[PDB]
Design an enzyme around this catalytic site. Structure first.
Site, mmCIF file in Angstrom:
data_model
loop_
_atom_site.group_PDB
_atom_site.id
_atom_site.type_symbol
_atom_site.label_atom_id
_atom_site.label_comp_id
_atom_site.label_asym_id
_atom_site.label_seq_id
_atom_site.Cartn_x
_atom_site.Cartn_y
_atom_site.Cartn_z
ATOM 1 N N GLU A 791 0.387 36.908 8.407
ATOM 2 C CA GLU A 791 -0.497 35.936 7.778
ATOM 3 C C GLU A 791 0.360 35.146 6.803
ATOM 4 O O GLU A 791 0.913 35.709 5.855
ATOM 5 C CB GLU A 791 -1.662 36.674 7.127
ATOM 6 C CG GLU A 791 -2.504 37.437 8.170
ATOM 7 C CD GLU A 791 -3.015 36.522 9.291
ATOM 8 O OE1 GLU A 791 -4.055 35.864 9.083
ATOM 9 O OE2 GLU A 791 -2.378 36.450 10.372
ATOM 10 N N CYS A 825 -2.253 31.035 -1.163
ATOM 11 C CA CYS A 825 -1.913 30.500 0.147
ATOM 12 C C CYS A 825 -2.928 29.461 0.589
ATOM 13 O O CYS A 825 -2.601 28.567 1.367
ATOM 14 C CB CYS A 825 -1.854 31.629 1.166
ATOM 15 S SG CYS A 825 -3.309 32.682 1.150
HETATM 16 N N1 LIG Z 1 -2.096 33.642 5.173
HETATM 17 C C1 LIG Z 1 -2.460 34.404 4.028
HETATM 18 O O1 LIG Z 1 -3.525 34.992 3.962
HETATM 19 C C2 LIG Z 1 -1.553 34.467 2.850
HETATM 20 C C3 LIG Z 1 -1.987 35.146 1.688
HETATM 21 C C4 LIG Z 1 -1.189 35.189 0.527
HETATM 22 C C5 LIG Z 1 0.062 34.603 0.572
HETATM 23 N N2 LIG Z 1 0.523 33.985 1.742
HETATM 24 C C6 LIG Z 1 1.824 33.385 1.725
HETATM 25 O O2 LIG Z 1 2.692 34.250 1.047
HETATM 26 C C7 LIG Z 1 3.684 33.457 0.462
HETATM 27 C C8 LIG Z 1 3.910 33.853 -0.987
HETATM 28 O O3 LIG Z 1 4.203 35.213 -1.126
HETATM 29 P P1 LIG Z 1 5.698 35.720 -1.347
HETATM 30 O O4 LIG Z 1 6.450 34.691 -2.140
HETATM 31 O O5 LIG Z 1 5.662 37.085 -1.942
HETATM 32 O O6 LIG Z 1 6.272 35.765 0.148
HETATM 33 P P2 LIG Z 1 7.600 36.175 0.732
HETATM 34 O O7 LIG Z 1 7.769 35.649 2.176
HETATM 35 O O8 LIG Z 1 8.560 35.727 -0.263
HETATM 36 O O9 LIG Z 1 7.612 37.643 0.543
HETATM 37 C C9 LIG Z 1 6.613 38.424 1.145
HETATM 38 C C10 LIG Z 1 7.025 39.879 1.340
HETATM 39 O O10 LIG Z 1 7.998 39.991 2.361
HETATM 40 C C11 LIG Z 1 9.069 40.726 1.800
HETATM 41 N N3 LIG Z 1 10.284 40.303 2.450
HETATM 42 C C12 LIG Z 1 11.161 39.285 2.108
HETATM 43 N N4 LIG Z 1 12.136 39.213 3.017
HETATM 44 C C13 LIG Z 1 11.916 40.171 3.997
HETATM 45 C C14 LIG Z 1 12.569 40.547 5.152
HETATM 46 N N5 LIG Z 1 13.771 39.880 5.549
HETATM 47 N N6 LIG Z 1 12.059 41.534 5.889
HETATM 48 C C15 LIG Z 1 10.930 42.205 5.556
HETATM 49 N N7 LIG Z 1 10.254 41.871 4.427
HETATM 50 C C16 LIG Z 1 10.731 40.872 3.656
HETATM 51 C C17 LIG Z 1 9.020 40.522 0.335
HETATM 52 O O11 LIG Z 1 9.680 41.523 -0.363
HETATM 53 C C18 LIG Z 1 7.560 40.565 0.112
HETATM 54 O O12 LIG Z 1 7.076 41.857 0.031
HETATM 55 C C19 LIG Z 1 3.262 32.029 0.576
HETATM 56 O O13 LIG Z 1 3.946 31.383 1.572
HETATM 57 C C20 LIG Z 1 1.833 32.148 0.897
HETATM 58 O O14 LIG Z 1 1.297 31.027 1.532
HETATM 59 C C21 LIG Z 1 -0.287 33.906 2.898
#
Ligand SMILES: NC(=O)c1ccc[n+]([C@@H]2O[C@H](COP(=O)([O-])OP(=O)(O)OC[C@H]3O[C@@H](n4cnc5c(N)ncnc54)[C@H](O)[C@@H]3O)[C@@H](O)[C@H]2O)c1
Ligand SMILES: Cc1cc2nc3c(=O)[nH]c(=O)nc-3n(C[C@H](O)[C@H](O)[C@H](O)COP(=O)(O)OP(=O)(O)OC[C@H]3O[C@@H](n4cnc5c(N)ncnc54)[C@H](O)[C@@H]3O)c2cc1C
Ligand SMILES: OCc1ccc2[nH]ccc2c1
Ligand SMILES: [Mg+2]
Lengths: 1214, 107, 54
Positions: A791, A825
């Site tokens: 997501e 998001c």
């Molecule tokens: N579609 C939805 O419902 C929804 C909801 C909330 C946030 N978001 C999205 O989330 C983003 C913001 O959150 P964020 O900054 O924490 O996101 P992110 O992509 O920076 O990080 C998300 C998670 O993935 C982990 N991560 C980072 N690199 C990884 C890798 N190579 N392998 C496995 N895990 C990894 C991070 O540690 C963290 O736990 C925004 O883009 C937002 O739009 C989407």
């Protein structure tokens, strides 16, 4: 460095005993409020008989003595024709020159083609005219029906009917809905009834200032009106002479308890200046009563004004109290005491209350304990009479003003007050153009010889129509004025005594049977999460202490493996709004311990799977109770760790509670022994919803029977650790729920671990793509792809047309774009304004922007907190500077110096030339604005779709044709009509997008748990009676080709598909929340055999999709002579990356073929594809080898049906 | 048009009136795509006619007619099917296409 | 109104001329009455000076 929460929400003044009694009654149960009101409103049998006789006499006079009705009758108009005619008349009256209007009517309008001569739909205000013509309210306008009706009536009746409509609308809008267009006109027209013994209170129609400039405009309108009214009063004084009524919300754009300091510092002096002028002319100045959450705040202003010696000598200060409110008698005690202390004879207008349906909706939305208003109309009537008794006992110190159109209420008070009367003792009040027929039976020595003050709206057509809907509803089935005109309602019914009717009920004061308490919105399914009322001083005082206590706690996050906490690298967690505020400490997980955690989860998987689903769900329910109880402490942590305001944090905790209870209930509805868990599930969560999304993913995986490796975002480990601690306390074994704090390396190590059986990811699209690539090399022990729910980001747009109400748009835009500093998001990224209204809305938007308070979030007054890290700040600022460097206009709030200790980005508005100016999601408080011409709306929707994202989308319009067009063409998972776009209420707006925004299934929706088991159950309500016609054509083609078993499988897929499911989900009043299943789009088919291709095609067509079939399969000769309907949906693809974006894939092959195909699919540009794979033998054995759940797309649509200003359904609730 | 229905009288006059209840909030999506195509090629008058046809079309009307209890009597407007277009000029063809597409038809 | 009032006589003719039963003759006359009243009402709802006859 200020102590955390030391200045969270101090009250304006220490709360006296009287003030505390008000607050205590705020949401008191209705059964507790009524008995004392019944007692106070009781009158002697002689009085009750006399009152009924007087009420009957008044009602007989009223009924013994229409304009629109006569027009409808004369020209045989349908209801839609009547409405359309009034809309045309309204538009014709926007032509100033009378001769120019008459020429347009005679020469152009009357000869048809009214469309050619009249950027703004004629029918923008048709909901208001609908109420006028039909007495029924509609939230949106069927503009095509009205256009047809207008054409029909003009072609049938010509100029005479247009003339009659114009003259009718001119009379109504200039003489009935308002006393005058200007205060001078209103004053001239007031002489007639003043000569008969009426008085006036003028209302300049200001309300709900959005900007400083609006507030200044309403101020100068009031000031100019006071001069005109005072000049006209000419020394008649406050009782005989006219006065003014003001709304505090008109005088400051941030009139709220959260902004109490600004209210006292900035609004209060403005009221004082107006009151000083009213004092000099010796006229009344009344403070109108507005929403329930403004009542107690307004008392602080009333107190200061009445104690201010500069206003001494003048008794014209007035204040409204709403008898539908549970605090009313306690407010009156406070006011009467204030009148005694100040020596000011406060004018007290007793009303029933004008915001009833909005109060019901607000309390439900906010999950509060009860309503601040009664829910049975008869309760308000008893409250009114009881409060009148209190006021009539205090006429020496207050001047009661009984505002009502209800002849029974009037008669009861007339007799309660007795035969001794003098002008100045008390008065009645009524509304201009509504109450005169009743009060002409009251005023004057030949009637009841009691005075009545007419509340006189003053303003133009534009201002009048803005809130006429609410004003007319005051028209509901329970309203006296509606009932007096209903022939089926007898006079005996109208003169029924509400006091004696209430006293004789089985349970005195029971809540209305048809109105759900907020906790009960979902009935037997589950208990709604509860919020907190940040307007309640008791709540604020208790929350202040709990928040301070939370900041003293030594919050930690540790790798919590099945075998106990593990050692690791430890660092502090700093408050993003002030790096000097250390929130806690996190010990991060080594990649060795992450791999160990997965192995421990694998070993514990059978034990957790063996816990019966109902007991797993009981753990979730217990965790929800624990989170609800701990909410205040959780708020404090979220506020300090993740930059959230208190409101942001309440939403966050409520959402977590709702996920727990929703997935528990969904489990109890579905899961059985045949729905086997996947195995260890890696839950990777984003920082920005650090408890809600974290809890949702884990709870769903756990309750489906999977042990979970929980990897919270590196920015927000503390609240995640507390959520794990709560789930463990609720009974989740440590082996089933392991917490692995750390950065993306910990996430990646978990994803890559051999025993990982599924991945639930919420985060950026770019990271999801890395995970997709990691998993493309992997297969389950059964040789099938590892499920990934990903997501991801949004590029969320809102389209606003010229029918939308600018103030409503701006509020929803400010909330959607800048709530949580745009770190949702769902946040609004691109506002699209129809060109004809863009300048006005943009001006209002910029004004509203500058009223936001940005700062460290441990203050109730802070609207917008920090961005999470300096890197996030740098990334956002780089985007802003690029835009500024391109010459785009950039509006930014000035930040206070105190923000320097944290990482803040000011809310920013950037005016773009084209939507292509944007590349990827900018996750910060940055709103982009584009303008569009109305004829280009369809191209604009294409442009929104063309970004590839598809998360949230908003539309502000009153026009059904535009709603139908836009919502049918937009491709996004969560649609919102006439409201903000950040709603994600679990089970109400199941949340999740498509394209670059998600794979689905939606979190908080009924397909979610089914993705976390090997065989998906049938979700509640998941079926459709509709069969895709292309599927049916394909099944017939298969039979004609002799593929008999495949034709049968195709027919079965057609029936099994839930494409076309269309449900309304239970939620709050004043909203319709819809959930529908659509096709995903174009599915990539990678078959191996002819039968496999036929099964893949049947699955995809049955779910409404088109397909691109792998041309390298060599199976082209298997699809000869397709019907055109099927051929239109079929393409053959040699270069898959050239023929996307796809919305999913179906793969047939052995394990190594599946793996190779999965790698090629992961390499395709754009969206993550939900891939399903099966061997040829599995296709032969299992009719559900390809599950149709994952071949449809869920769409949630949330429609604000109160947007027109009232709730039609609640008009029948009394 | 059907006897005993609201389109019937309009066939018996030289300019048809707008029948009672005859409208639809639905806009044919192919009509909309055609209008955008006309926009792209600068056929401004035809694009306007196409949008107007999309709006005035009653395709998708779906009404319940008053009648006896214990019965639901529904009346709906669908595409006719495939319309034969016999144009003479390019503009005439665009107008014919707009009319047929706005009403859900193929040509 | 005239067909309604004269329905019994009209039934007799329809029964004998067209082989209809009494019930189907009643339906026949009712339908004629309904056409008359329906087209009358539809006219009152729609027709104006610009809707010239053929
Ligand atoms: N579609 C939805 O419902 C929804 C909801 C909330 C946030 N978001 C999205 O989330 C983003 C913001 O959150 P964020 O900054 O924490 O996101 P992110 O992509 O920076 O990080 C998300 C998670 O993935 C982990 N991560 C980072 N690199 C990884 C890798 N190579 N392998 C496995 N895990 C990894 C991070 O540690 C963290 O736990 C925004 O883009 C937002 O739009 C989407
Ligand atoms: C001169 C004047 C000044 C006013 N000033 C204000 C103001 O400053 N603030 C304000 O809020 N309104 C104000 N009002 C409006 C007033 O509050 C009422 O909405 C309106 O006058 C209708 O009440 P009524 O007694 O005339 O009629 P009624 O038909 O007797 O009462 C209708 C009222 O009952 C209440 N009600 C309806 N349904 C329910 C229900 N299911 N449960 C509980 N209660 C229900 C509502 O308050 C509704 O307006 C004013 C009205 C007048 C005439
Ligand atoms: O909130 C102020 C308010 C609201 C509704 C009303 N109706 C008549 C007067 C009046 C005033
Ligand atoms: Mg990150």
């Amino acid at each position: 460095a200020p102590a955390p929460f030391a200045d969270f929400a101090p009250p304006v003044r220490p709360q006296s005993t009287l003030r505390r009694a008000i607050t205590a009654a705020y949401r008191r149960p209705e059964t507790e409020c009524l008995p004392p009101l019944v007692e106070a409103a009781t009158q002697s049998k002689e009085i009750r008989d006399a009152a009924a006789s007087t009420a009957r006499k008044l009602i007989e006079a009223l009924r013994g003595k229409s304009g629109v009705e006569g027009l409808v009758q004369e020209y045989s108009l349908s209801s839609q024709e009547g409405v359309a005619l009034m809309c045309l008349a309204e538009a014709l009256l926007r032509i100033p020159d009378t001769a120019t209007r008459d020429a347009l009517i005679r020469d152009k309008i009357a000869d048809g083609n009214w469309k050619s001569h009249l950027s703004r739909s004629l029918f923008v205000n048709a909901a208001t005219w609908g109420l006028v013509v039909t007495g029924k309210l509609t939230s949106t306008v069927n503009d095509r029906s009205l256009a047809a009706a207008l054409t029909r009536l003009i072609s049938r009746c010509g100029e005479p009917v247009i003339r009659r409509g114009v003259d009718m609308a001119m009379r109504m809008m200039g003489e009935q809905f308002v006393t005058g267009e200007t205060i001078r006109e209103a004053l001239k027209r007031s002489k007639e009834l003043e000569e008969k013994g009426f008085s006036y209170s003028y209302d300049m129609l200001g309300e709900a200032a959005t900007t400083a400039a609006d507030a200044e405009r309403y101020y100068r309108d009031y000031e100019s009106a006071i001069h005109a009214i005072g000049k006209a009063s000419a020394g008649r004084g406050i009782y005989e002479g006219p006065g003014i009524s003001i709304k505090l919300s008109a005088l400051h754009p941030r009139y709220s308890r959260a902004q109490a300091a600004r209210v006292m510092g900035e609004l209060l002096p403005r009221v004082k200046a107006l009151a000083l002028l009213a004092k000099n002319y010796d006229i009344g100045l009344n403070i109108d009563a507005e929403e329930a959450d403004r009542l107690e705040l307004s008392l602080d202003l009333l107190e200061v004004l009445c104690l201010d010696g500069d206003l001494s000598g003048w008794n014209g200060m007035g204040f409204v109290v709403q008898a539908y409110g549970k605090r009313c008698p306690f407010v009156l005690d406070f006011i009467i005491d204030l009148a005694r202390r100040s020596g000011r004879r406060i004018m007290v207008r007793l009303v029933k209350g004008a915001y009833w349906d909005a109060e019901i909706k607000r309390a439900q939305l906010d999950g509060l304990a009860d309503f601040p208003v009664f829910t049975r109309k008869i309760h308000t009537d008893v409250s009114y009479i009881a409060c009148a008794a209190k006021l009539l006992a205090a006429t020496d110190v207050v001047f009661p003003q009984f505002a009502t159109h209800n002849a029974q209420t009037l008669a009861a008070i007339y007799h309660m007050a007795g035969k001794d009367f003098h002008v100045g003792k008390y008065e009645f009040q009524c509304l201009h153009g509504m109450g005169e027929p009743l009060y002409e039976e009251v005023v004057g020595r030949g009637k009841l010889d009691r005075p009545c003050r007419i509340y006189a709206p003053v303003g133009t057509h534009e201002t009048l129509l803005a809130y006429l809907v609410r004003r007319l509803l005051e028209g509901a089935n329970s309203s006296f004025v509606h009932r007096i005109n209903d022939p089926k309602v007898s006079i005996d019914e109208l003169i029924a005594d509400p006091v004696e009717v209430v006293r004789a009920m089985p349970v005195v004061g029971a809540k209305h049977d048809r109105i759900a308490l907020p906790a009960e919105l979902f009935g037997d399914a589950r208990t709604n999460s509860a919020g907190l009322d940040l307007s309640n001083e008791e709540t604020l005082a208790s929350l202040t202490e709990a928040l301070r206590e939370s900041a003293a706690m030594k919050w930690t996050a540790l790798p919590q493996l099945a075998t106990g906490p593990a050692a690791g690298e430890t660092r502090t967690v700093l408050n993003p709004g002030d790096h000097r505020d250390v929130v806690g400490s996190v010990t991060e997980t080594s990649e060795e311990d992450a791999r160990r955690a997965v192995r421990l989860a694998a070993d514990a998987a059978p034990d957790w799977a063996a816990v019966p689903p109902s007991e797993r769900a009981a753990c979730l329910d217990r965790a929800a109770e624990l989170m609800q109880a701990r909410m205040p402490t959780l708020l404090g942590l979220i506020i300090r760790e993740a930059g959230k305001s208190a409101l942001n944090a309440i939403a966050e905790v409520r959402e977590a509670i709702d996920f727990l209870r929703y997935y528990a209930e969904q489990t109890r509805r579905t899961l059985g022994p045949g729905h086997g868990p996947l195995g260890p599930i890696v839950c990777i969560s984003p920082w920005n919803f650090p408890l809600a999304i974290f809890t949702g993913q884990i709870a769903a995986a756990l309750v489906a029977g999977n042990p979970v490796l929980a990897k919270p975002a590196e920015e927000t480990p503390l609240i995640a650790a507390e959520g794990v601690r709560i789930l463990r306390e609720a009974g989740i074994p440590a082996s089933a729920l392991q917490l692995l704090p750390g950065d993306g390396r910990v996430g990646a190590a978990l994803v890559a671990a051999a025993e990982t059986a599924g991945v639930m990811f919420t985060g950026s699209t770019e990271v999801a793509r890395l995970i997709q690539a990691q998993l493309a090399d992997r297969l389950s022990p059964a040789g099938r792809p590892i499920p990934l729910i990903a997501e991801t980001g949004g590029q969320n747009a809102m389209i606003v047309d010229s029918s939308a109400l600018a103030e409503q748009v701006v509020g929803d835009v400010i909330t959607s774009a800048f709530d949580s500093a745009g770190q949702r998001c769902s946040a609004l990224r691109v506002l699209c304004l129809q060109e004809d209204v863009a300048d006005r809305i943009l001006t209002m938007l910029k004004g509203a922007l500058h009223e936001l308070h940005i700062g460290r979030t441990d203050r109730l007054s802070v609207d917008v907190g920090p961005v999470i890290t300096s890197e996030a700040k740098d990334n956002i600022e780089k985007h802003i500077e690029r835009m500024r460097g391109l010459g785009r206009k950039v509006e930014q709030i000035g930040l206070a110096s105190e923000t320097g200790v944290g990482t803040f980005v000011p809310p920013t508005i950037i005016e773009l030339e084209k939507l292509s100016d944007l590349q990827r999601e900018v996750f910060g408080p940055v709103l982009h604005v584009i303008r569009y011409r109305r004829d280009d709306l369809d191209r604009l929707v294409d442009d929104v779709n063309a970004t590839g994202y598809g998360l949230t989308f908003g539309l502000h319009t009153r026009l059904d044709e535009t709603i139908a067009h836009v919502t049918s063409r937009i491709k996004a998972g969560n649609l919102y009509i006439n409201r903000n776009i950040i709603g994600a209420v679990v089970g109400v707006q199941p949340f999740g997008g498509r394209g670059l925004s998600g794979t689905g299934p939606k979190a908080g929706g009924p397909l979610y748990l089914g993705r976390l088991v090997t065989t998906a159950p049938v979700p509640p309500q998941h079926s459709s009676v509709h069969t895709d016609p292309v599927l049916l054509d394909f099944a017939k083609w298969l039979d004609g080709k002799g593929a008999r078993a495949e034709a049968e499988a195709a027919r079965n897929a057609g029936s099994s598909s839930a494409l076309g499911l269309d449900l309304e989900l239970p939620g709050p009043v004043g909203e319709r929340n819809l959930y529908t299943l659509h096709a995903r789009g174009r599915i990539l088919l990678v078959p191996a055999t002819e039968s496999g291709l036929y099964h893949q095609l049947a699955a995809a067509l049955a779910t409404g999709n088109s397909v691109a079939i792998d041309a390298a399969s060599g199976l082209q000769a298997s699809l000869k002579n397709l019907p055109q309907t099927v051929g239109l949906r079929v393409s053959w693809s040699k270069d898959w990356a050239a023929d996307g974006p796809f919305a999913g894939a179906l793969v047939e092959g052995d394990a190594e073929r599946i793996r190779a195909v999965n790698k090629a699919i992961a390499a395709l540009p754009g969206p993550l594809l939900l891939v399903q794979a099966a061997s040829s033998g599995e296709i032969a054995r299992n009719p559900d080898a390809y599950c149709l759940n994952w071949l449809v797309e869920e769409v949630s649509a949330s429609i604000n049906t109160a947007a027109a200003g009232g709730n039609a359904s609640l008009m029948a609730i009394g």
